[PDB]
Write a protein that binds this ligand. Structure first.
Ligand SMILES: NC(=O)c1ccc[n+]([C@@H]2O[C@H](COP(=O)([O-])OP(=O)(O)OC[C@H]3O[C@@H](n4cnc5c(N)ncnc54)[C@H](OP(=O)(O)O)[C@@H]3O)[C@@H](O)[C@H]2O)c1
Ligand SMILES: CCc1cccc(NC(=O)c2cc3cccc(O)c3oc2=N)c1
Length: 316
């Protein structure tokens, strides 16, 4: 039920449903599970142009509005501007296209998906003849201006960023004629990478930290090294789960909630979708918090080193 107030005065529900699924999963699944997530109790729905599912997710949202389950105002829907669209003149059309695909009039939240700008084209990851991705050099403050223009148009209620570090955040915050702060910064966050310093920064600036891969990544072969620790197998989360008679995933999500982090949970399984909303049903002790805090290994699951060269590469 709980929401946090955003620095533009809108409210963001603190538990969000992640909708990304690999290309293998049929697109119809995005429709089904998103309706399930809404039926379960989620009111915050995270998507993006990249995820190739905005048609299905928007259809689920429209279906739940139209069967009378919720109203548009109950749903907090997030889309993301992809990095082939960072040139300012490309920002508003991308949003419009996302809206046309999702069949909604506005998103509650529009994010700059990543700081590292790509070559503009009809392709989503443009690669040259050797298969290397072609970068673009764009001053992200101009991207931000185009984002602010989307806010004034009513196309996005709130605007924020994702995968930005301290430097990129303050580069937006120092911006001359800044009309709107980012309400939020959506970054990878879980017990093996808690972002305690980044989070403290944000709390100072009134920017919500939004955790993704907060259950430990879906562990795609393409992006994640399978030898990395499995977060939901962690001994301390398994211990706390048996102690509270919950599950490791519930421990992880509650961990974020109690340290003031809005947390995303992806699940395409109906039982886990309905289980994840029990995060509001129990609390961890300050000592449980301490023991999870102690798991921090500054561990990225998303291996991005073919982009280290990028001037805007987030964690240099
Ligand atoms: N801004 C960014 O760059 C960025 C990057 C990555 C992700 N995201 C967003 O964050 C969302 C979530 O992150 P994510 O995709 O990395 O996945 P995640 O939330 O870390 O979840 C990972 C896996 O945990 C499993 N799981 C879910 N609930 C569970 C439970 N109660 N018990 C045990 N296992 C459970 C799910 O498998 P089942 O489906 O089988 O349950 C899921 O595939 C994404 O869907 C996307 O919206 C954003
Ligand atoms: C300058 C563009 C650029 C350059 C280098 C890396 C990236 N990052 C990604 O490939 C992403 C993968 C992804 C995957 C699943 C869900 C997401 O939400 C994701 O988000 C991403 N940004 C972007």
């Amino acid at each position: 039920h709980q929401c946090v107030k955003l620095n533009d005065g809108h409210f963001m529900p603190v538990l969000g449903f992640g909708t990304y699924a690999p290309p293998e999963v049929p697109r119809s699944k995005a429709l089904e599970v998103t309706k399930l997530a809404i039926e379960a109790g989620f009111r915050h729905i995270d998507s993006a142009h990249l995820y190739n599912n905005e048609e299905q997710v928007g259809l689920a949202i429209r279906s739940k509005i139209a069967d009378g389950s919720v109203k548009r105002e109950d749903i907090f829907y997030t889309s993301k501007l992809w990095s082939t669209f960072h040139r300012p003149e490309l920002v508003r059309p991308a949003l419009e296209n996302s809206l046309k695909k999702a069949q909604l009039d506005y998103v509650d939240l529009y994010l700059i998906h990543s700081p590292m700008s790509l070559k503009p084209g009809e392709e989503l990851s443009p690669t040259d003849e050797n298969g290397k991705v072609i970068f673009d050099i764009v001053d992200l403050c101009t991207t931000w201006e185009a984002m602010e223009k989307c806010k004034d148009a009513g196309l996005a209620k709130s605007i924020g960023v994702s995968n930005f570090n301290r430097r990129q955040l303050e580069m937006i915050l120092n911006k001359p004629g800044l009309k709107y702060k980012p309400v939020c910064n959506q970054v990878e966050c879980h017990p093996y990478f808690n972002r305690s310093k980044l989070l403290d920064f944000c709390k100072s600036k009134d920017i919500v930290l939004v955790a993704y891969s907060a259950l430990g990544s879906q562990r795609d072969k393409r992006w994640v090294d399978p030898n990395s620790p499995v977060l939901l197998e962690d001994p301390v989360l398994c211990a706390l789960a048996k102690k509270h008679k919950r599950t490791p995933a519930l421990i992880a999500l509650r961990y974020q909630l109690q340290r003031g982090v809005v947390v995303l949970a992806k699940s395409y399984n109906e039982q886990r979708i309905r289980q994840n909303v029990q995060v509001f049903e129990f609390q961890l002790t300050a000592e449980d918090m301490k023991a999870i805090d102690g798991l921090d290994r500054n561990l990225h699951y998303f291996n991005s080193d073919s982009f280290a060269s990028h001037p805007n590469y987030p964690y240099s």
